[PDB]
């Protein structure tokens, strides 16, 4: 297939491995979920604008909506981690190991 | 697969309408009135054949009928039309609303010297019927035999033979 899908899928995989390998800091990986949403947006939108399947043009908007509709969720779940502990480090969330 | 079959370069040579887009847009309503029939035969052939290679000859009729539209403007009303497409040609979006006095002069000179009525608001968007002698294409998608569907269910539904037959359940 076309050349740009290589790099947009590459950016998805880069953001995937960035999300899936934590650096002990939860906000730095909540950016990686938002980057995966960006890469899925641009990939789906290139496919939809390419093929002129115009009725799915409303699809990435909807996709983008649920992007922040979980990203806000993560931030609402970031502040409860950072109120229990002074930092949002992910290694403070190990109480459920026993 | 197969060789794609394209027409030759001599098959595509026709006397083009070598005028600009403002010249076309200025004469557009009278073109839609007077050059109705070969244009609609062509667009009917174009949506029915779904292939431009089977639409060249009718298309040439379009390129035959447009030029005779303009020569009949050029023989009679060349100067009011020239002023009118110049005034249309000035604008960026090419507004009809900025050029109503040259439009009135052009429509008056055309209606006097040639007897053409300008189409009103709503007429050129009508769906019209076209009388052609070319055959209706029986397979414009170049499709093939659709596969045979699975056989339906028929017959009265009898009870299950000896129940469920699940290892020992006798019902």
């Amino acid at each position: 297939m076309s050349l740009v899908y290589m790099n947009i899928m590459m950016a998805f995989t880069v953001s995937l491995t960035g999300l899936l390998m934590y650096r002990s800091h939860l906000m730095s990986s909540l950016l990686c979920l938002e980057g995966m949403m960006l890469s899925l947006f641009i990939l789906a939108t290139l496919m939809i604008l390419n093929s002129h399947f115009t009725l799915a043009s409303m699809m990435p908007i909807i996709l983008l909506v649920f992007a922040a509709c979980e990203a806000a969720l993560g931030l609402s779940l970031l502040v409860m981690v950072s109120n229990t502990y002074g930092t949002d480090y992910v290694q403070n969330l190990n109480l459920l190991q026993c | 697969p197969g060789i794609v079959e394209l027409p030759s370069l001599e098959d595509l040579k026709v006397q083009e309408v070598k005028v600009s887009s403002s010249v076309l847009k200025a004469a557009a309503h009278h073109y839609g009135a007077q050059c109705d029939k070969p244009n609609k035969e062509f667009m009917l052939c174009r949506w029915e054949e779904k292939d431009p290679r089977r639409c060249l000859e009718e298309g040439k009729l379009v390129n035959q009928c447009a030029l005779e539209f303009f020569r009949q403007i050029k023989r009679h009303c060349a100067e009011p039309f020239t002023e009118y497409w110049t005034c249309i040609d000035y604008s960026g979006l090419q507004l009809f609303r900025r050029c109503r006095k040259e439009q009135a002069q052009f429509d008056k000179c055309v209606l006097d010297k040639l007897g053409w009525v300008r189409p009103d608001l709503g007429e050129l968007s009508k769906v019209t019927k076209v009388k052609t002698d070319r055959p209706l294409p029986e397979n414009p998608y170049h499709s093939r035999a659709r596969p045979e569907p699975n056989p339906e269910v028929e017959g009265d539904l009898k009870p299950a033979r000896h129940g469920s037959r699940l290892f020992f359940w006798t019902m």
């Binding site: 949403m37 979980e70 779940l77 969330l93 | -």
Partner: protein, 347 residues
């Protein structure tokens, strides 16, 4: 929580599962999963302690990663098929990514690393919601894409889930982690029979949901979250020890109980397809699940662990709890095996 808000949030969890179940479009599947996760996060944080916040963070990260992989599988299907219908997938890469996404959403091994954590962190009612109602939407999507599921992938996920969920519960004294590794092993049983006969997948799902809802309703009715607090039940309500006895012996796959019903039928559908080694290893590995079930029956019903003095006060107070459908679910989880050919209604 304000009970109007609790009603609206639980109806939104149900709405997300229904939107996954009824929709023919992939974007609506993804919307249903997003709505399901988004609404179930405050059910986990109903109590506002650090363990519920940790469980909700781990659950959000796992389910968000799974939904990313799901939408990437959807977009690759859009490329290689030009359409959005919820049916088989037209690319093995999208098939793998969607199978990984649904295996993460089920908590099947080796993506199982959140189910004991999240199940221990949250209450017993929200743990019941997690282990039963959240196992309905990915099993819908797995029921719908089985012409494209890789055989080796779903069988590796299935037997790896059965083995890891067997070994995990042996080292547990917390009841919620026991039910979570039990969940892992049972989802392995359900997905192993998925490509052979998905009616048996639905049968195992329904019998599992009945038995798990019975066990969580018994835990809530006794207010027990550890093994050693479940062991005081003989001194307080001795009928509950009988009910956890019959339900835990049912969950181990022992005849003549209904939890023997799915397992046997799964074996009954895997030997038809000339697979003899795999359901044999699955059956033998289910003895580990049976072993920690038998450990709980030893601590609760078959012996009498020593109680405390303050139990004498709880003799004077009956249960005012809504033990909703507990006798119905206890009868259905134990005495349903003579009605085994009822599974044909799931065809």
């Amino acid at each position: 929580m304000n009970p109007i808000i609790l009603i609206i949030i639980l109806m939104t969890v149900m709405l997300g599962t229904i939107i996954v179940m009824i929709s023919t479009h992939w974007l609506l599947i993804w919307i249903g999963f997003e709505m399901n996760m988004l609404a179930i996060i405050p059910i986990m944080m109903k109590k506002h302690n650090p363990r519920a916040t940790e469980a909700s963070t781990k659950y959000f990260l796992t389910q968000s990663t799974a939904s990313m992989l799901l939408m990437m599988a959807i977009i690759i299907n859009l490329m290689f098929s030009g359409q959005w219908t919820v049916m088989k997938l037209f690319n093995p890469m999208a098939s793998m990514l969607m199978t990984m996404a649904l295996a993460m959403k089920l908590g099947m091994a080796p993506f199982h690393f959140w189910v004991p954590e999240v199940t221990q962190g949250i209450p017993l009612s929200s743990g019941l919601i997690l282990l039963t109602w959240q196992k309905l939407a990915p099993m819908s999507v797995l029921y719908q894409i089985l012409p494209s599921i890789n055989l080796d992938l779903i069988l590796t996920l299935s037997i790896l889930s059965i083995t890891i969920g067997g070994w995990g519960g042996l080292n547990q004294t917390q009841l919620r982690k026991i039910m979570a590794y039990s969940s892992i092993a049972h989802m392995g049983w359900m997905t192993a029979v998925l490509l052979y006969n998905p009616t048996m997948t639905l049968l195992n799902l329904i019998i599992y949901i009945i038995m798990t809802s019975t066990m969580f309703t018994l835990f809530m009715a006794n207010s027990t979250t550890t093994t050693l607090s479940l062991s005081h039940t003989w001194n307080k309500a001795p009928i509950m020890t009988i009910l956890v006895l019959i339900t835990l012996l049912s969950m181990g796959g022992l005849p003549p109980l209904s939890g023997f019903m799915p397992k046997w039928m799964i074996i009954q559908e895997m030997t038809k397809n000339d697979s003899i080694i795999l359901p044999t290893l699955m059956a033998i590995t289910a003895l580990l699940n049976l072993y920690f079930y038998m450990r709980l029956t030893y601590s609760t019903a078959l012996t009498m662990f020593p109680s405390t003095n303050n139990m004498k006060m709880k003799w004077q107070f009956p249960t005012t709890k809504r033990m909703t459908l507990l006798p119905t679910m206890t009868v259905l989880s134990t005495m349903l095996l003579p009605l085994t050919p009822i599974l044909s209604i799931l065809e």
